[PDB]
């Protein structure tokens, strides 16, 4: 299962 | 931008036996950026139904792909892999050698 949070760089 | 040229290996899934169905592999690795063109060749002509693995990369960020197709090796048919990449002036052809 992947990491569920996305954050723009 | 630093670019890295592909390493190329051409080889069979199983030990090569004339008349016996097998798989011809072309493994390209250590390259960057990711765009690359790979064909498998039988006596100089592009083989039609070649498949490939999903794009992934190594710990050093360099990309790798496996291209493959069913083939039946014979005494006289010559197999090869044709590879082009931004780092290459013209395509590189690597022949299949059954002891390599």
């Amino acid at each position: 299962l992947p990491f569920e949070k996305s954050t723009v760089m | 931008m630093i670019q890295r040229t592909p390493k190329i290996q051409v080889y069979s899934r199983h030990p090569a036996e004339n008349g016996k169905s097998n798989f011809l592999n072309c493994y390209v690795s250590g390259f960057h950026p990711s765009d690359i063109e790979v064909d498998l060749l039988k006596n100089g002509e592009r083989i039609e139904k070649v498949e490939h693995s999903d794009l992934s990369f190594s710990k050093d960020w360099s990309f790798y792909l496996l291209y493959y197709t069913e083939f039946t090796p014979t005494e006289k048919d010559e197999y090869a892999c044709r590879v082009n990449h931004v780092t290459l002036s013209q395509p590189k052809i690597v022949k299949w050698d059954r002891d390599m």
Binding site: L1, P2, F3, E4, K5, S6, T7, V8, M9 | M1, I2, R4, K7, Q9, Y11, R13, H14, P15, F23, N25, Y27, S29, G30, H32, P33, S34, S53, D54, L55, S56, F57, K59, W61, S62, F63, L66, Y68, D99
Partner: protein, 276 residues
């Protein structure tokens, strides 16, 4: 049995051949199990190993929602990093990320990883303490500050120590017949004259899993590191791997040479010679 899980993301801009492509793949050890491609006719998370197929609709939707959000996030990140480096729109660039967890053998979180790169150079990495960042340059420092503001390291630590590990263990149990099975190499030594006075001994290892293996040649019981031609370990295409190592030897001295192979699947290490 020392196991890991990793996800590999590649986001690639391509002006003006449409929007950046985002592709994610997931691996347990040397086995790929899932993929997502923003370029596919219908973008969705797809199984790539038989043991993951038993996961239900809710798993597949969960994955697809995350990778779709990541597709949009990475396109913004590509814009941002082009900005940070004063790069033109001309102009194709790549962000890569690899993150995941390692278990011991044993079975508990050994350590976690989260690293990003830009055009194939280290950009930002989560430190082993899972609490602080290592940023490569003044551009990556901007990313670091943004990531601190959104408490990313804390979220990653929670994932790497919790979910990453829990799901890795579930996959290992579900796919235990393959993932927890080490297939030993099949080995032999070939001999081909190169000239009247020299010959190549090639030590072959075929059909092995996982990819990790050691192949060495010795002359009189000492390593032949500079003289061994060593090929990169390569996939056979049926989950197994292949490798060889070659030395060129003076003719008549063949018996002074031994090939040594170590691999998890072997009862005990192998010692091979050319057998005329």
């Amino acid at each position: 049995g020392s196991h890991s899980m990793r996800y590999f993301y590649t986001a690639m801009s391509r002006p003006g051949r449409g929007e950046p492509r985002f592709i994610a793949v997931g691996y347990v050890d040397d086995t790929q199990f899932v993929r997502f491609d923003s370029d596919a006719a219908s973008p969705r998370t797809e199984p790539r190993a038989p043991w993951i197929e038993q996961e239900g609709p809710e798993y597949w939707d969960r994955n697809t929602q995350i990778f779709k959000t990541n597709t949009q996030t990475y396109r913004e990140s590509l814009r941002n990093l082009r900005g940070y480096y004063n790069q033109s729109e001309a102009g194709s660039h790549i962000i890569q990320r690899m993150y995941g967890c390692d278990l011991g053998p044993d079975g508990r979180l050994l350590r976690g990883h989260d690293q990003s790169a830009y055009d194939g150079k280290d950009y930002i990495a989560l430190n082993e303490d899972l609490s602080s960042w290592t940023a490569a340059d003044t551009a990556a420092q901007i990313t670091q500050r943004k990531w601190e503001a959104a408490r990313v390291a804390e979220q990653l630590r929670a994932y790497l120590e919790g979910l990453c590990v829990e799901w890795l263990r579930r996959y290992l149990e579900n796919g235990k017949e393959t993932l927890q099975r080490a297939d030993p190499p099949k080995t032999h030594v070939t001999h081909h004259p190169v000239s009247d006075h020299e010959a190549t001994l090639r030590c072959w290892a075929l059909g092995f899993y996982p990819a990790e293996i050691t192949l060495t040649w010795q002359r009189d019981g000492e390593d032949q590191t500079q003289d061994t031609e060593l090929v990169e370990t390569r996939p056979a295409g049926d989950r197994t791997f292949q490798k060889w190592a070659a030395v060129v030897v003076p003719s008549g001295e063949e018996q002074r040479y031994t090939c040594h192979v170590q691999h998890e699947g072997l009862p005990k290490p192998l010692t091979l010679r050319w057998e005329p």
